[PDB]
Amino acid sequence: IIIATKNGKVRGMQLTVFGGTVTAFLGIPYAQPPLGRLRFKKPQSLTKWSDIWNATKYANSCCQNIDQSFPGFHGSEMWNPNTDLSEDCLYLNVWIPAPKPKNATVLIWIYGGGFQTGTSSLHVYDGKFLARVERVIVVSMNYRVGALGFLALPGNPEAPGNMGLFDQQLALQWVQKNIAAFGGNPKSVTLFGESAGAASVSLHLLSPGSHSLFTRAILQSGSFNAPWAVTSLYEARNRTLNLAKLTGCSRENETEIIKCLRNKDPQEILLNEAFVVPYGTPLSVNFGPTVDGDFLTDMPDILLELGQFKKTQILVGVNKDEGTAFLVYGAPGFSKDNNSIITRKEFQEGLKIFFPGVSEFGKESILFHYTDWVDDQRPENYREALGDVVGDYNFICPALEFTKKFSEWGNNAFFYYFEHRSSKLPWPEWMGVMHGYEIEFVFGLPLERRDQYTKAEEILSRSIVKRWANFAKYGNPQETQNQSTSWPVFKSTEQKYLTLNTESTRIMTKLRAQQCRFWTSFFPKV
Ligand SMILES: *[C@@H]1O[C@H](CO[C@@H]2O[C@@H](C)[C@@H](O)[C@@H](O)[C@@H]2O)[C@@H](O[C@@H]2O[C@H](CO)[C@@H](O)[C@H](O)[C@H]2NC(C)=O)[C@H](O)[C@H]1NC(C)=O
Ligand SMILES: *[C@@H]1O[C@H](CO[C@@H]2O[C@@H](C)[C@@H](O)[C@@H](O)[C@@H]2O)[C@@H](O[C@@H]2O[C@H](CO)[C@@H](O)[C@H](O)[C@H]2NC(C)=O)[C@H](O)[C@H]1NC(C)=O
Ligand SMILES: CCCC[NH2+][C@@H](Cc1c[nH]c2ccccc12)C(=O)NCCC1CCCCCC1
Ligand SMILES: *[C@@H]1O[C@H](CO[C@@H]2O[C@@H](C)[C@@H](O)[C@@H](O)[C@@H]2O)[C@@H](O)[C@H](O)[C@H]1NC(C)=O
Ligand SMILES: *[C@@H]1O[C@H](CO)[C@@H](O)[C@H](O)[C@H]1NC(C)=O
Ligand SMILES: *[C@@H]1O[C@H](CO)[C@@H](O)[C@H](O)[C@H]1NC(C)=O
Ligand SMILES: *[C@@H]1O[C@H](CO)[C@@H](O)[C@H](O)[C@H]1NC(C)=O
Known part of the structure; x- marks a missing residue:
């Protein structure tokens, strides 16, 4: 119940899971609270305590704007913070099997949310099922988001950028120093994350400071080369300066700008985040990772292309829609409340929404490549084309290109295509297999028979959980016992991938080949 860590004792709590027990330590601090003069700085190391820290409830979530687009609607509100927001939010959670394991492999979750939102306490990130079922240790951390986590004046230690990535890194360091006391093996640590959390994972593969802090990596629906994932230094300074003007903090001393921003209340900073760009989209990442010369030593596309990254195995994948x-x-x-049959002209207006700074030629080229119909008279043609445009450009083609370029330097990579739509999905059926809705299967929520998933979903989640655990423990995402399809390595020539669904698991090749040639080779030119 009580574990001695290098900064003090912590008390956990026992949970009943599937006729067994899991010990949870919720809300262990891993850094000094980044308050006052510490706002916008890299996280500082923790000073010891002599009490017993009671890690028996999730801690505060980091300050963030909330999704209010659909109040009362579970599909959007399941992603909203479920603990108090506070700048005092640098905490992590640990789930361990009971009895205490001897040398357990460790899975560290990094949540997504566009680098502007998210928290480790969400129901769909509950690590207790993985600890129970696979006897791994699960760790998750809160990291700063939005301008409080990623505001940048590159070079200036008062606001250097990438602070939220250094939060993640300091939690990785905490696991290295402390997890053996919990029964974990610090030499067998796998990072996993989704969307911006997966982009974060991919940046830890690039950052020399993270290379000794983990073993292997899992990237669900994200990678740093996605168009939303990295902010240019030009964009970053324009956005910092716009925030200053919107808050009355414009100065000529850039350090004085930061000191003035340090006296604003968190809500004043949050309120102005959306407006630091002239044209926002549903994928706007107003404050995100930058090339800071510290966490990131060079433009990450260059590092990837030239093989400058941790050499290890990776597991990468995307969802169908x-x-x-x-x-x-x-x-x-x-609208989520009708079948959203749109017209050609609505499609064209939709491209303006998603590609605001793109030339008319650029937008025509998207239309040309996505509107060559198998049948001109299917009413849902344009609705489905716009969803595929947004998904291929922002998630699928960057994930495949990351996997190709990473595998070219000699490491085993495994790619999946998740195409099962949750029987409980609150969003309408036209949205299909949505962004974020593989997470609950990875975390084993359908293994709880009391919670209305189908039997086919229980079996799918059980197999995914085993494959993820075998990847973390052994570097190989096989399910070896139940006559399962073998998962081949992804190589840049054949480009084999595994489909994940309740019916038939299949080996396929060259996912989205035609679409990704457009996005990866042509569209970056316009
Ligand atoms: C870089 O920033 C300038 C300034 O942005 C404006 O002021 C901010 C405080 C915020 O309120 C933004 O929403 C504003 O747009 C941008 O310059 C503006 O650009 C728009 C359209 O491009 C134009 O209508 C405004 O008149 C411009 N305002 C000024 C003061 O020049 C600029 O577009 C930003 N982006 C880049 C890439 O430079
Ligand atoms: C699907 O709904 C959208 C959104 O309209 C809102 O939601 C509806 C479910 C209903 O509550 C409406 O009263 C709401 O306004 C519709 O888009 C609207 O379409 C009308 C006419 O084309 C137009 O007045 C609005 O500007 C549109 N709203 C937008 C563009 O945001 C859409 O027409 C509906 N489609 C189908 C097939 O029913
Ligand atoms: C301030 C509240 C949210 C801030 N607006 C953006 C920020 C953002 C969140 N995830 C991102 C991935 C890449 C780029 C940006 C983002 C936004 O929510 N888009 C819609 C996200 C949907 C939510 C409904 C169902 C779940 C799927 C994801
Ligand atoms: C830490 O917790 C100690 C014991 O708390 C026990 O567990 C919690 C979940 C409650 O059920 C409580 O009634 C139990 O006794 C306390 O004795 C101690 O004061 C706590 N420390 C602080 C700083 O609050
Ligand atoms: C855990 O395993 C590692 C190798 O992965 C080994 O070096 C270490 O000594 C082990 N620790 C134990 C068994 O306590
Ligand atoms: C103002 O800028 C100078 C460098 O131009 C810097 O040394 C100084 O610290 C800044 N002012 C304050 C109060 O920090
Ligand atoms: C393998 O199949 C059995 C049923 O024979 C099932 O109970 C078990 O959970 C399966 N294991 C995995 C890892 O899927």
Whole structure:
């Protein structure tokens, strides 16, 4: 119940899971609270305590704007913070099997949310099922988001950028120093994350400071080369300066700008985040990772291309309908409450929403490549084309290109295509297999028979959980016992991938080949 860590004792709590027990330590601090003069700085190391820290409830979530697009609606509100917001939010959680394991492999979760939102306490990130079923240790941390986590004046230690990535890194360090006391093996640590959390995982593969802090990596629906994931230094300074003007903090001393921003209340900073860009989209990442010369030593596309990254195994994948969720956050003619049949002209207006700074030629080229119909008279043609545009550009083609370029330097990579739509999905059926809705299967929520998933979903989640655990423990995402399809390595020539669904698991090749040639080779030119 009580574990001695290098900064003090912590008390956990026992949970009953599937006729067994899991010990949970919720809300262990891993850094000094980044308050006052510490706002916008890299996280500082923790000073010891002599009490017993009671880690028996989730801690505060980091300050963030909330999704208010659909009040009362579970599909959006399940992603909203479920603990108090506070700048005092640098805490982590640990789930361990009971009895205490001897040398357990460790899975560290990094949540997503566009680098502007998210928290480790969400129901769909509950690590107790993985600890119970696979006898791994699960760790998750809160990290700063939005301008409080990623505001940048590159070079200036008062606001250097990437602070939220250094939060993640300091939690990785905490696991290295402390997890053996919990029965974990610090030499067998796998990072996993989704969307911006997966982009974060991919940046830890690039950052020399993270290379000794983990073993292997899992990237669900994200990678740093996605178009939303990295902010240019030009964009970053324009956005910091715009925030200053919107808050009355414009100065000529850049350090004086930061000191003035340090006296604003968190809510004043949050209120102005959306407006630091002239044209926002549903995928806007107003404050995100930058090339800071510290966490990130060079433009990450260069590092990837030239093989400058941790050499290890990776597991990467995407969902069938990544793009559909974003359509109801601004595209005309779309609604979660009807079937969103749109016209050609609405499609064209939708491209303006999603590609505001793109030339007319660029937008025509998207239309040309996505509107060559198998049948001109299917009413859902344009609705489905816009979702695929958004998903292929923002998630699928960057994930495949990351996997290709990473595998070219000699490491085993495994790619999946998740195509099962949750029987409980609160969003409409036209949105299909949405962004974020593989997470509950990875965390084993359908293994709880009391919670209304189908039997086929229980079996799918059980197999995914085993494959993820075998990847973390052994570097190989096989399910070896139940006559399962073998998961081949992804190589840049054959490009084999595994489909995940309740019916038939299949080996396929060259996912989205035609679409990704457009996005990866042509579209970056316009
Ligand atoms: C870089 O920032 C300038 C300034 O942005 C404006 O002021 C901010 C405080 C915020 O309120 C933004 O929403 C404003 O747009 C941008 O310049 C503006 O650009 C728009 C359209 O491009 C134009 O209508 C405004 O008149 C411009 N305002 C000024 C003062 O020049 C600029 O577009 C931003 N982006 C880039 C890439 O430079
Ligand atoms: C699907 O709904 C959208 C959104 O309209 C809102 O939601 C509806 C469910 C209903 O409550 C409406 O009263 C709401 O306004 C519809 O888009 C609207 O379409 C009308 C006419 O084309 C137009 O007046 C609005 O500007 C549109 N809203 C936008 C673009 O945001 C859409 O027409 C509906 N589609 C179908 C097939 O029913
Ligand atoms: C301040 C509240 C949210 C801030 N607006 C953006 C920020 C953002 C969140 N995830 C992102 C991935 C890439 C780029 C940006 C983002 C936004 O929510 N888009 C819609 C997200 C949907 C939610 C409904 C169903 C779940 C799928 C994801
Ligand atoms: C830490 O917790 C100690 C014991 O708390 C026990 O567990 C919690 C969940 C409650 O059920 C409580 O009634 C139990 O006794 C306390 O004795 C101690 O004061 C706590 N420390 C602080 C700083 O609050
Ligand atoms: C855990 O395993 C590692 C190798 O992965 C080994 O070096 C270490 O000594 C082990 N610790 C134990 C068994 O306590
Ligand atoms: C103002 O800028 C100078 C460098 O131009 C810097 O040394 C100084 O610290 C800044 N002012 C304050 C109060 O920090
Ligand atoms: C393998 O199949 C059995 C049923 O024969 C099932 O109970 C078990 O959970 C399966 N294991 C995995 C890892 O899927």
